[PDB]
Amino acid sequence: AHKELKFGVEGRAALLNGVETLAKAVATTLGPKGRNVLIESTFGSPKITKDGVTVAKAISLKDKFENLGAKLLAEVASKTNEVAGDGTTTATVLARAIFSEMVKNVAAGCNPMDLRRGIQAAVDAVVEYLQQNKRDITTSAEIAQVATISANGDQHIGKLIASAMEKVGKEGVITVKEGKTLQDELEVTEGMRFDRGFVSPYFITDAKAQKVEFEKPLILLSEQKISAATDIIPALEISHKMRRPLVIIAEDIDGEALAVCILNKLRGQLEVAAVKAPGFGDNRKSILGDIAVLTNGTVFTNELDVKLEKVTPDMLGSTGSITITKEDTIILNGDGSKDAIAQRCEQIRGAMNDPSTSEYEKEKLQERLAKLSGGVAVIKVGGSSEVEVGEKKDRFVDALNATRAAVEEGILPGGGTALIKASVNALNNLKPANFDQQLGVNIIKNAITRPARMIVENAGLEGSVVIGKISDEYAADFNKGFNSATGEYVDMIQAGILDPLKVVRTGLIDASGVASLLGTTEVAIVEA
Amino acid sequence: AHKELKFGVEGRAALLNGVETLAKAVATTLGPKGRNVLIESTFGSPKITKDGVTVAKAISLKDKFENLGAKLLAEVASKTNEVAGDGTTTATVLARAIFSEMVKNVAAGCNPMDLRRGIQAAVDAVVEYLQQNKRDITTSAEIAQVATISANGDQHIGKLIASAMEKVGKEGVITVKEGKTLQDELEVTEGMRFDRGFVSPYFITDAKAQKVEFEKPLILLSEQKISAATDIIPALEISHKMRRPLVIIAEDIDGEALAVCILNKLRGQLEVAAVKAPGFGDNRKSILGDIAVLTNGTVFTNELDVKLEKVTPDMLGSTGSITITKEDTIILNGDGSKDAIAQRCEQIRGAMNDPSTSEYEKEKLQERLAKLSGGVAVIKVGGSSEVEVGEKKDRFVDALNATRAAVEEGILPGGGTALIKASVNALNNLKPANFDQQLGVNIIKNAITRPARMIVENAGLEGSVVIGKISDEYAADFNKGFNSATGEYVDMIQAGILDPLKVVRTGLIDASGVASLLGTTEVAIVEA
Amino acid sequence: AHKELKFGVEGRAALLNGVETLAKAVATTLGPKGRNVLIESTFGSPKITKDGVTVAKAISLKDKFENLGAKLLAEVASKTNEVAGDGTTTATVLARAIFSEMVKNVAAGCNPMDLRRGIQAAVDAVVEYLQQNKRDITTSAEIAQVATISANGDQHIGKLIASAMEKVGKEGVITVKEGKTLQDELEVTEGMRFDRGFVSPYFITDAKAQKVEFEKPLILLSEQKISAATDIIPALEISHKMRRPLVIIAEDIDGEALAVCILNKLRGQLEVAAVKAPGFGDNRKSILGDIAVLTNGTVFTNELDVKLEKVTPDMLGSTGSITITKEDTIILNGDGSKDAIAQRCEQIRGAMNDPSTSEYEKEKLQERLAKLSGGVAVIKVGGSSEVEVGEKKDRFVDALNATRAAVEEGILPGGGTALIKASVNALNNLKPANFDQQLGVNIIKNAITRPARMIVENAGLEGSVVIGKISDEYAADFNKGFNSATGEYVDMIQAGILDPLKVVRTGLIDASGVASLLGTTEVAIVEA
Amino acid sequence: MIVENAGLEGSVVIGKISDEYAADFNKGFNSATGEYVDMIQAGILDPLKVVRTGLIDASGVASLLGTTEVAIVEA
Asked: Hey, what's the signal peptide range on this chain (chains A, B, C) (predicted)?
C-alpha cells in the first residue's frame, strides 16, 4: 500500500536506462568470440558464465524502474528461450535498439502510434523476405550435415544417431539410465507422448536434470475429480508395500495425502507423481481409451460401470519404462496385448471407410493414427562415468532441439548476415504513406544491424567497415558474410555457421513487440 | 490516537493534487488508442495493464491527503464499474475536471453552494437532453448488430447466441463446465435467481473466476436463525459421507461448525456454502414456498409442524445444476414434479380472478409469474482447452453485460461525441438566476469536453481542432464525430463505436456528485 | 548588465504582494479617524506622519519586484497628488483592490482583455453617473460655505478672503513677505502668469517653501538661443554691482556662466533665475510683446533691429514684485506706462471689429484679453511670527487649491458615500455582452466600496453593517451616508464633509488604468 | 457561523436581526433560502432543553478552563 509514480519522459528514460544496461551486460557474450561473465553462488565459491540466459536472469538493477524494465526484458528473453532454445542475446539487443530509437523519436515529437504501425509493417516485410529466401532441410545427407554442424561437428556418432532417428521417427526423445556403458545404440519402440508436467515442483528429487528412475512403473487412469483420500489411499499404500513406482492423474489435488504421508514419515518411502488431466473432453476420452489399450485396458469413471473404490493392482496398467518431467510426459513400451491392439487398429481402419463419419472424430482419429503408428523414437545415450553420460545427454538434447527447429522451420546463415541481407534487400521496397511510418521503417533498418555489429565488435575488428562490406559489396550473395572465427568473408553454408529461421524470427518478433509496447507507456508505478 | 489537521485551502489543494495525479495516470489508457501501464505483482515478475480499473485501484500516493483523495476517487470508480462495467476512466476524468474548476472558482471568492446548485441543474439538463436524443434497441436485427459491435465484431457466433438468448429470455446467465468441447449451444431451462452471495470469502476455492463445481447438488431450506451445531451436524456429515454438494441458508452464522471441521481435518472433505436469507418477510415465505415447489417440497420452520431436528436426506431438495457466486445465486433444472407445479400454477391463475385479492400479494405473485414462467436463459459456452474456454467465458460475460446495459437503457455514439453534442445543444438554453450558478454552468460546459479531448490527444492529433470541428461544423448531426481509430469524421452508428446511455449517465452523475462534495470540505484529517 | 526574469503568475504574485503591502501601509491613515505613522529622518530624531503621500513615497520593500510595484504605485499616487492635491490614499486602495480582483480572476482562466474592457466600461459608467448627480458651486454664499468647510471651518477670515478673491478674480495667487503683521488684506493688481519653472533646482535657496525675496526685480526678455557668455556677462555683473534681482530667459542654458561665477566666488553674490522660453511660436511672440508692454517695452531678437549686444540697464524691464517657483511664474505690478497700454488695448479692440481677422489670432488675442483685463488676484497673508505666517500661508494654499478644484469641477459627499451610491445606482444598468465583461463589472462593483470600508474600519465600527445600511436603506438619498467623526448617519452636505469631483474622478481613473495595466504583464525584469 | 457557512456575510445579517427585528422574536434569517422569514412558519426550530444545556455546559467549561494556571501532561 505504498507506490510512487513516474510520468511520461521520466519513466521512459528510467526504462531506457534499465533495458540498455541489461542488454549491454548480456551482449558481451554474443557471437562465437564471446567474453565471459563472473557469477557467484549464494554458498561456496563463484562460477563462470559464457552464455546469455543465466546472466540475463541474474540481473537486478539499483532503481526500481530499471529493475522493472530488466524484469520485463527477462520475461521476453525467457519466453524466447523456452520457445526456441537460443537467440536470446540477439533478441535482447534488437529490443534494446528498437526501444532506444523509438523513445528518441518520441522525444522529438513524433506520433508513437504511427511509429509502431510502421515498425510492425517493416518487421512483417522483413520476416516475409527471410521466409522467401530461406532453404529447406529435406535430404538425409544434408540432414546429417546440419545435425553435425549443430552439434559442433566433432559429434559424428551423434549426428549419425540424429539422422537415423529423424529418418525413422518424428517425435523423438532422449533418456539416460545409470552408467549406460553402451555405444549409443538407437531403437524403435511404440509409445505415447503428451505435454503436461507435475503440478508441484517437489515430486522429482533430481529436478535439475530430470533423471529417469521409473523402471517398469505402474500407472493409474482416472477421469473424475480426485479430492479425498478415501479411494486413493490403498493404491499408494500397496505400491509402497511392493516398492513399485506409481502415478496419479487428478484434475485438481492439493496433496493432502502427500502431506499426511510426509508427516507420518518424511520423504524416502514413496514416489509421488501427480499430473493434471488434459482437456478436449471427447478427445480426452479417446486418449484415455488409447492409453488404456496400450498399457492398462481399464479406466476409472463413476459414469462407467467400473466401481470407483476398486483400487487394486489387478487391473493397474504397466509399461516397460516411463519418463515424466516438468513440461511433458514420455510413455513407451506399452504392456498391452498386441493382438487386441491390432484388432482395434483394423476396426478403426474399417471405420475410416464410412463417408458419414464426423469430421472432428475423423481428424482426431487420423492424428491418433499419425502419433501412434509411427512410434516414439528413443535413443539410449552412452558414456563411461555419470558426469560423462550426463554431459553427453545435455549435448544430445541441445543438438536434437536445434535439429528439430531447423527441420520444422529452416536454416539461415548465422552471425547476423541474414539480418543484414534482409534489411538491405527488403525494406527498400516498402512505401509508407505518412512520414512517421517512414521514420519507423528507418528505425527498424538501423536497429536490425545491431546484433551483427555486436558480433563483429566482440572479436575486435571494427563493425562499421565489416557491415559496409557485407551490405554493399556482397548484397547479391545472401550467403556471403563475415566469419568472426577467422576474419575472412566466407559463406556460412560451407563454413558450417547457421541460424534456424524459427529462433531468429521469433526473437525478432518478440523484440519488436516488446519495444513497441514499452515505447507507449507514459505511466509506470513501482512498490516501496 | 494521533491526527493532523489541514484547513480550507491547504486541504483542498492536497485533494486536488491527489485527484489530479490519479486521474492523469488513469486517463493514459482512455479511448481505443490507449497506452499501456506497467504493473508488478508482489511475487514473480511484472505484468502489463491496458485498462483503467486495475491501475485506478492500485494507486497510493506519497502524502496522506493525496492518498485520501485517491481512495475516494477509487471508491466512486469502483461503484461505477460495479453498476455499469465500463466508463470508469471517463467518470474519473470528468470528476477531476469538475473538481479542479470548482476549487479554482472557490479560490476566487465565489460561493460554493451556488456553484454546486448550478452544476447540479446543468447536469440534470445534460442527462435529460441525452435521454431525449437517444435511440432504443428493440428489433432483433439491430439487437444482433449491437451484440456484434459490443463483442468486437469478430464474435459472430457470440452475437447470434446473444440475440437468440435475448429473444428467448430476459434474465440470462453464463456457466462453464469442464472442457465443453461443444459448439456453444443454447438451451432454455426453468430455474430461479436471487442476488445474495456468500457471507464469507473462503467458501469458494476458485473465487478468481467463480468456477462451477456443483453437479446435481442438494440444497437446504430454512427460515429460523441457525447458531448451533445441534441440528445441522448430521446434514453436513451425511453429505460428506455420500460425497454430495450441499448449501446452508442461515440468517447469521459465525462458522463455528466450519472451524471445528477444518481443525479436525483441513479443507478437502466438504463443500461449505452459506448464503444469508433474504428479507421481505411475507415475500420471503412466498419465495421459500416457490423454491420448495421447484426443488424441495419441504421447508424448515419451528412454527410449522415440521420438526427442526429432522435433518435427513429424505426430503432434502435437489436440482440439475446450481451456480452461486459472491453477488448472486443461479438455480436451474428444478427436480420437483411438473404435474403438481402445473396444478399450483393453475391455482394461482384462478386466484388472479378474485377482485378482492390484496394489491401487494397480487403484485408479488405477478412478478413471481414473470420471473418463473419465462425461465432462466442458460448458454453452454464452448472451447477447446481450459484457458480457451475461460477466455471465451469472460468474453461472453462482458458482451452480455454490455448488451443488457444497452437494452435496458439505450446506446449513444461513443468516443465522447455524445458528450460534446449535449454540452453544445443543451446548456445554451439554461438561464440561471444568480451569477455563481452561471459560473457553475460554464464550469460543467468546459469540463464535459475533457474525455473527448483526452481520447483525441491519446492518438496523437490535436484535441482542440477536433473538438472545434465536432462542436461547430457538425452541431446539427448528433452521430457525427471523430473516429480516433482512423482519423476520419464518420458516424459511430455506422462505424460500430457506441457507448450505452446507462454507463455514461451514471459515470457523469457520480463524477458530478463526488466533485461537488469534494469542493465543499474545508477540513480533512488523516492518521499518523 | 545583470537581470533576472519572472514570468506570468510568479511576477504577478510578486507585484500583488508589493502593491498590497504598500496599500495596507498607506490606508492606515485613511479617513478623518486616521492613525499615525512613525518616520525617522537620516539625521536627528524621528518625526510623526498622519498623511498618505509621504509614507507612500517613503516605502521600499525587500524584494526587487515588490519594490518595482511599490514604485509604480508611488508614480501614480504622485501624479494624482500633483493633479488634484488629495485623494491619494483612496486611489491607492482602489488600485490595490482592482488589481487583486483582476489577478484572482486571471488565475481562474478568465480572459484579461475582456476583463479590462469590462472594467473600463464600468468605470466610464460610474464617472458618468457621478457627473450626472453632482452639484455646482456658483452662488457666493455657498462659495464662502465651501471655502469654510474646505478650510476646517475655523478659518472664517480665510473663507471670507477666498470668497472675495473668487468674486474679484479667477487666476489667484498667494505670497508671503517677511513678518506681514497685517490682518490678511486682499488687493487687485494687474499682472501675468505662466507655468514654466526653473531648469535647475539650485536657483532657489528656500526651495522647501518657495520664499519670496524679489522686491522690485529687473527682468530680461529674449527669444533667440543663449549658449555663450559674450552677450550675457555685463547684465549679471551690473546687477550684482547695484545689488538688484534679475532673471534669465534662455531656450537651453547649461549654466557655464553660473559655474564660473560660483568658482570665482561661491554662492552669496548674485541671484540666478533661469526659466526656459515657452512654445507656441507666434503666440510666443505675442506673449513677449505683451510682457514687454506691461513691464519692459523692448525685446531681444537678432531678426529684430535691436542689437544683441545691447545689454544695459537702460531698457531692462521692471515690476513691483515677482514670484517664480519650480512649476509656474507669477508676475504682478507691471511698471509700463498705463497710457500706452490703454492705447494698445483700444487698438486691439478696434482690430476685433474686422471680420477678416484670422481665427487663430482672434482666439489668441481673446484669451490674452481674458487673462490680462481681469488681473492677477493677490492676497497678502498675515501673521505674527515667521512660523505663524508660514503655517498660515500653507493653510491658505491648500484651502485655495481645494476651492479651485471644487469650483472647476464640483463637490460630492465625502467619506466614500458618493462611491457607494454610484456603485449601487450605476452598474446595475450596464448589460455586458460576454461573460468576462460581466465578471469585470462585478470586480469593479466589489472594489469601489473598499475606501469606504477602510474609512469605517479605521474608526473601529464594523464596515460591513455600515456599508449595508448605506447601500440598501439609504439608496435613494445620495447625500445620506455615515459620519465617522460621530458615528451617526447624517448628510455630509449639512455636516460639512465633502470630496470634490475632480480629485475622486481622477483618482478612480488613474487607479483603474494602473490596475488594468498591471494585470496584463506576464514578464517583468529587475536589476541585480 | 451559521450565516457564514452558507456564504453571506454574517455581520450584516446579525445587524439586521438584532436591530431591525428586535421586537419580533420569531423573525430571523433563513439560511436555506436567504430570506428573513419566521422559523415557526418555516419549520426551523431548536428545543429549549438542548440549547439551554449546551449554553450552560459551554459557559461552565469555559469558566473552569479560564482559571487553570497549572496543567500537567504525561511523557
From this structure: none
